[PDB]
Amino acid sequence: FMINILSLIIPILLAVAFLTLVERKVLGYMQLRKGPNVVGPYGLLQPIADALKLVTKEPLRPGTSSISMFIIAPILGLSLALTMWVPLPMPYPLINMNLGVLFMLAMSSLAVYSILWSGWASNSKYALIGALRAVAQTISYEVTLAIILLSVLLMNGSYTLSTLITTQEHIWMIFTSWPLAMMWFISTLAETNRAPFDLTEGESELVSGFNVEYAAGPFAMFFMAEYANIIMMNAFTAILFLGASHDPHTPELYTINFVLKTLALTITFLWIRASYPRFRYDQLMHLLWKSFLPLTLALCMWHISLPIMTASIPPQS
Amino acid sequence: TYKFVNMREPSMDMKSVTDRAAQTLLWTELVRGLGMTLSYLFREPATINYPFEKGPLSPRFRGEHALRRYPSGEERCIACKLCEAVCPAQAITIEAEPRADGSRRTTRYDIDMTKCIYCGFCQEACPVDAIVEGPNFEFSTETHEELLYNKEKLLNNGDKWEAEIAANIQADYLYR
Amino acid sequence: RKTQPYDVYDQVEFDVPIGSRGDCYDRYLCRVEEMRQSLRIISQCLNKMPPGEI
Amino acid sequence: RGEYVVAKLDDLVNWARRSSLWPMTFGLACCAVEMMHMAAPRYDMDRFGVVFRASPRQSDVMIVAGTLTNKMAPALRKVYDQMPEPRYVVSMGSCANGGGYYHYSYSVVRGCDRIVPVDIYVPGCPPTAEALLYGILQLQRKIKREKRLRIWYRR
Amino acid sequence: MNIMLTLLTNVTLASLLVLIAFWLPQLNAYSEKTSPYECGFDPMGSARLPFSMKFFLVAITFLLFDLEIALLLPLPWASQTNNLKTMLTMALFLLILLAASLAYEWTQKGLEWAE
Amino acid sequence: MELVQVLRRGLQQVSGHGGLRGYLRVLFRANDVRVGTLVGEDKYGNKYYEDNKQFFGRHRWVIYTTEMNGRDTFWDVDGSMVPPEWHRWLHCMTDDPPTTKPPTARKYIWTNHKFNVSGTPQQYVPYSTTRKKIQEWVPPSTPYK
Amino acid sequence: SKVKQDMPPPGGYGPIDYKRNLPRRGLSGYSMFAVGIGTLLFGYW
Amino acid sequence: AMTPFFWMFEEREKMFEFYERVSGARMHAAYIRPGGVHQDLPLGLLDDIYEFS
Amino acid sequence: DTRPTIRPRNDVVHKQLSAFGQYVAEILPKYVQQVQVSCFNELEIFIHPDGVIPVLTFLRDHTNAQFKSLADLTAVDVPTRQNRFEIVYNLLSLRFNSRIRVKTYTDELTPIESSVTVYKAANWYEREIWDMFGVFFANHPDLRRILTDYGFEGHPFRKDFPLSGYVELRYDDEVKRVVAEPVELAQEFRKFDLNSPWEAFPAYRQPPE
Ligand code: SF4
Numbered sequence A: 001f002m003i004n005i006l007s008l009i010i011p012i013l014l015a016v017a018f019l020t021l022v023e024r025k026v027l028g029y030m031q032l033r034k035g036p037n038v039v040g041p042y043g044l045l046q047p048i049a050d051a052l053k054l055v056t057k058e059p060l061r062p063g064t065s066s067i068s069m070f071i072i073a074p075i076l077g078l079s080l081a082l083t084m085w086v087p088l089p090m091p092y093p094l095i096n097m098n099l100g101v102l103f104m105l106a107m108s109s110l111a112v113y114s115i116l117w118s119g120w121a122s123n124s125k126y127a128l129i130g131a132l133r134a135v136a137q138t139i140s141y142e143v144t145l146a147i148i149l150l151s152v153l154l155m156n157g158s159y160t161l162s163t164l165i166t167t168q169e170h171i172w173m174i175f176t177s178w179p180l181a182m183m184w185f186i187s188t189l190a191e192t193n194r195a196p197f198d199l200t201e202g203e204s205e206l207v208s209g210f211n212v213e214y215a216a217g218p219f220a221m222f223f224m225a226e227y228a229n230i231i232m233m234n235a236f237t238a239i240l241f242l243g244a245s246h247d248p249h250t251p252e253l254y255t256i257n258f259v260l261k262t263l264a265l266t267i268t269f270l271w272i273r274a275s276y277p278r279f280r281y282d283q284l285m286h287l288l289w290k291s292f293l294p295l296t297l298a299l300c301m302w303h304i305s306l307p308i309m310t311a312s313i314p315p316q317s
Numbered sequence B: 001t002y003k004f005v006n007m008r009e010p011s012m013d014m015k016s017v018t019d020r021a022a023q024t025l026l027w028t029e030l031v032r033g034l035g036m037t038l039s040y041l042f043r044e045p046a047t048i049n050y051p052f053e054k055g056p057l058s059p060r061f062r063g064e065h066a067l068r069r070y071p072s073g074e075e076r077c078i079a080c081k082l083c084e085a086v087c088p089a090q091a092i093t094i095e096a097e098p099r100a101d102g103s104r105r106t107t108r109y110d111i112d113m114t115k116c117i118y119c120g121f122c123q124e125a126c127p128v129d130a131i132v133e134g135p136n137f138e139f140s141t142e143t144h145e146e147l148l149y150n151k152e153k154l155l156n157n158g159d160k161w162e163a164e165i166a167a168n169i170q171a172d173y174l175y176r
Numbered sequence C: 001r002k003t004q005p006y007d008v009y010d011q012v013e014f015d016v017p018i019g020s021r022g023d024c025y026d027r028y029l030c031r032v033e034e035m036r037q038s039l040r041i042i043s044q045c046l047n048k049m050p051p052g053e054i
Numbered sequence D: 001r002g003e004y005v006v007a008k009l010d011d012l013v014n015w016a017r018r019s020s021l022w023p024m025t026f027g028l029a030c031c032a033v034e035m036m037h038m039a040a041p042r043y044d045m046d047r048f049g050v051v052f053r054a055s056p057r058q059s060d061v062m063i064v065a066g067t068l069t070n071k072m073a074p075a076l077r078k079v080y081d082q083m084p085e086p087r088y089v090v091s092m093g094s095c096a097n098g099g100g101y102y103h104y105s106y107s108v109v110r111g112c113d114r115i116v117p118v119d120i121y122v123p124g125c126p127p128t129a130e131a132l133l134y135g136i137l138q139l140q141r142k143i144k145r146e147k148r149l150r151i152w153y154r155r
Numbered sequence E: 001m002n003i004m005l006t007l008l009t010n011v012t013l014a015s016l017l018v019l020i021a022f023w024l025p026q027l028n029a030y031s032e033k034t035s036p037y038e039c040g041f042d043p044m045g046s047a048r049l050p051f052s053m054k055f056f057l058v059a060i061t062f063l064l065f066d067l068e069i070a071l072l073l074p075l076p077w078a079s080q081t082n083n084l085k086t087m088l089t090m091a092l093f094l095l096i097l098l099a100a101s102l103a104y105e106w107t108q109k110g111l112e113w114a115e
Numbered sequence F: 001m002e003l004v005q006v007l008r009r010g011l012q013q014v015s016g017h018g019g020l021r022g023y024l025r026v027l028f029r030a031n032d033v034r035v036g037t038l039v040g041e042d043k044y045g046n047k048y049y050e051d052n053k054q055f056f057g058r059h060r061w062v063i064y065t066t067e068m069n070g071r072d073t074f075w076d077v078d079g080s081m082v083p084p085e086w087h088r089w090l091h092c093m094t095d096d097p098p099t100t101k102p103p104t105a106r107k108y109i110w111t112n113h114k115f116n117v118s119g120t121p122q123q124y125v126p127y128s129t130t131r132k133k134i135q136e137w138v139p140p141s142t143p144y145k
Numbered sequence G: 001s002k003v004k005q006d007m008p009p010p011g012g013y014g015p016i017d018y019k020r021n022l023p024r025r026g027l028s029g030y031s032m033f034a035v036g037i038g039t040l041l042f043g044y045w
Numbered sequence H: 001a002m003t004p005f006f007w008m009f010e011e012r013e014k015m016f017e018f019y020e021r022v023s024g025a026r027m028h029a030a031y032i033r034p035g036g037v038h039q040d041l042p043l044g045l046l047d048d049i050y051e052f053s
Numbered sequence I: 001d002t003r004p005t006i007r008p009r010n011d012v013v014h015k016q017l018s019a020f021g022q023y024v025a026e027i028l029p030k031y032v033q034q035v036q037v038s039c040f041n042e043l044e045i046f047i048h049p050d051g052v053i054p055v056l057t058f059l060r061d062h063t064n065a066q067f068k069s070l071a072d073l074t075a076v077d078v079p080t081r082q083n084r085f086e087i088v089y090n091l092l093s094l095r096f097n098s099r100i101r102v103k104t105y106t107d108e109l110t111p112i113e114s115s116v117t118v119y120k121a122a123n124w125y126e127r128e129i130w131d132m133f134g135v136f137f138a139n140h141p142d143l144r145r146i147l148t149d150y151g152f153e154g155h156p157f158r159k160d161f162p163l164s165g166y167v168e169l170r171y172d173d174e175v176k177r178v179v180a181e182p183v184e185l186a187q188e189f190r191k192f193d194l195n196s197p198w199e200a201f202p203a204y205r206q207p208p209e
């Protein structure tokens, strides 16, 4: 059985590593630059070069830091991102899970706690402020994310991720809840801490946010954690709306379709990263509580009476 | 004459107001920047391949100093000290001595780059075009004592860099 | 340039963007428009280069 | 042979080091704006495999660019000491190399080397974007030419 | 216990990464490197002083709202009951009640940053 | 039709670059697969190419030699192997190769262009170029008079 | 020989544009909305 | 957003390209002096200015 | 000018500024001492130290002057005078697109009433001048060093202050932080007494004495 676990964990790390290359290269091509191409052919050896150099870099333990608190958070950040990859309905899920999204949602909230704890554990202004901007960021997206999650799968029938493939079947789910996918996609942007909503990092405003005292290996686990988080939750939005067909006799046909769906969607995550300025976390909780919340109620009311509207209540099993 | 920059009151017409509402609800001007950025992605990058490829330059470029010499072989410098008097950072130190023959040039000609400014003032201050700003921007090094040259290396620099400047002053002698 | 012209700036013709709110958006907009008006100055300067010394 | 093995692990270490070194987003004077000139798509900082990180706990090579002053001095030494090893320093321009145009000034320390150890002295005032981009290359060659674990084996 | 096995493996694999990133890559600390970062200078001295919120009002409303959503999570199963009539009214009633509370807070200032 | 046109352009690229070995050589060392006319070849083995059809700044380029003055440089390189005659042509300070019109050859110019000798033992050292200024009175050789 | 320097062409350089040339792209707000429900209603069917 | 920075620094570098063409260096020209500019523009510089503008 | 070498003149402006020069003189005869417009159309008002705040107030307030812009604060130091530092203001009138210069004199010890109330721009210009020259002004809000090094003693721009300074610093490993020491240059400033020994301008020559 454990052979299945390593084949689920190990490829993600290499996939996360090669995300750093495309992060630095498609951005550059999207930016009149050529991207990393000096290390091996076209730079495909650069993600490896980053990995060892970060690992062989000196780890740093600031004097005013809480040692145990400084170490537990990076473990929590990377472990949750990696264990986040077990329950997806990728053709044959590792663990069938009745409450698939609740398992998805619960530890996604626990993921920010590693983001949360590292700020004060580093014991300085530039990380305490970044940690507290993480509070306000997850103040905003969490109060509404469950509402979108409930609305989209209310037509699915239950919380099981596997039933998503059956529910979509003929047509893309986005065709039925396109304003919900409008809600869902950029709210995931607001949790992955990407360019428009990366206040927890905050390159320009506060040097590095919840990373300032972090060095070498702790970052390597942190860098992989948030890169694993974006890909996984993008794979989540891939099945949530763009689920493809699955033939039981040929499960590999689903993988090729699903991978591109979560890959082209990923290119979007790199796409917004180049073109958009930064939300101030003032308007971040302002916007998600002024227009986002009152709207997401309306379609939530729309999406509950409507299965009753046309006698289209989905079966739970 | 002036041009007002920021005031255009939007029309409250049904067609115009639903334009702004559609722009607000459906991100349209927001995707405009997103959409054009795609178009700029497909543009081939304007990156050179250093050092296999090097950027454009001009004959009147200022680089490392190089003391040249006459076609016979005698070094042009005649210790008029005008370069020292003009050098805005006093990077030049000059001492002179009549040695034996028609070759009294310098006891000492030390140009201090980490003090020098690369203004090039020494080049046009020289009445005999002895000290020149070479076309070589590529003279980096690892030790601080390296970044200063003696009189000898200025001669060696002028000896090593000779074809480039000889043609450069050939093309630029009328401009200055 | 307009109130106290210097050098040959009197002969050139251009516009100066004037803001209306004094906020960051106005200043950025005036900066953008000044660049466009700068290009117009280049066009007039390019087509009006006179002969003589330097 | 043990020396063969240590050399192979040595080759692995510096290749990752010189390929993935991260310059500091540190800029003081005229040199700083030309430093970001080569980071522009014309010369492509990133295509050589490097990316700008901000804090000392983040970067590899300090890139000192600009005039060094007495008031700037305490923070520069503090921020340099704050960078974990291995760490390298390159000195942009005549001013930071030593003294510079303001060598005789009352408020300029004559040399960044007087405050922080330096690997490479990149000259020019301002150095052309080509010249310092070689300075990064020379540091890649210098990082290549080490025997850190090799000298340890024979230590 | 399959979920336990992957959970144990996941936290284990994370611990090796921090383990060999703390012992293998050398060790050299001389105090000022170990010191906190204040953008180059020395901090005023704290990182423990009260960093008072300016959005404290919205934080508690999040607790009320994040709590009340747990009341409507059973919705997918609540749809498949023999009594969707009162189900529709009660489930609707909750959403208006959250809507009213959001509307109440909105009108009496609230969400905007308290100054 | 244009899609397969660029595919054969790549097929031409591997063929024109000395088959597979040369293409893998330039791809892994020269970092580029472009093919240009052989404009010149200096005495140091540095292979030079010119492609006027490409956009400005990528018309004239250099493939560095694998050997220079016992400083094997097949993998590592730097912007200083370029000899003085060609260094102006590479930087397009001019639109003439030295082959078309060689520079005026004189006695004192170097025959072997060198590079940055920094780090190597051939590196320069500052030294006094002046003689002694105050020489001391030599003590008498004779013993007590 | 006559004096020669860098000079504008005898007719002069071409007309240099400086104003905004921002495109007017997209479609009407009603059409964009009517499409939105149009595909939306298809979804529930 | 960082992309606008890299959009126009390319064009900013072209202005550096004519800068180095007509002056001694890229940035610090020491060109404009009391009594007039240091020396005349190179031939063909204005045409490049026309294309860039 | 048929000759293209020399700079032309704007006699209309020169007389016009001179008319306003005497204008201020009658308005405030207590404070102005002499008002002069230079050959290159620059009319300067020379006011008494103690009346610094009223004249600046008058130019900011009066309709006929309306000078409301503090262009620059300079206190050019001349060692040969008893009170060396001569504090020079710089004002621009937007409505009359003309520049005025009001200036006083003040030794190292005499305090001046700070002009921050009459010109908010004077605030930071005030923090710089006390730093470089050392002339304290009275009742300034937060008059304190804003140019020189933290704890740098001595006003560097003073005539008695050498250009190379008095101290230099260097990192020391035995104490593990930077530390100062007396300045000792690798190369001294080679003074260049290049002033021509022949008179350059008969017009500006001082009377025999
Ligand atoms: S450019 Fe020439 S004159 Fe100017 S400081 Fe440098 S060496 Fe001296």
Ligand code: SF4
Binding pocket: B076, B077, B078, B079, B080, B081, B082, B083, B084, B094, B125, B126, B127, B128, B129, B130, B131
């Ligand atoms: S280099 Fe030229 S200016 Fe300087 S001393 Fe020699 S001849 Fe005179």
Ligand code: SF4
Binding pocket: D029, D030, D031, D032, D065, D066, D067, D092, D093, D094, D095, D096, D100, D101, D124, D125, D126, D127
């Ligand atoms: S060396 Fe030149 S360009 Fe660099 S900071 Fe000093 S004055 Fe500016």
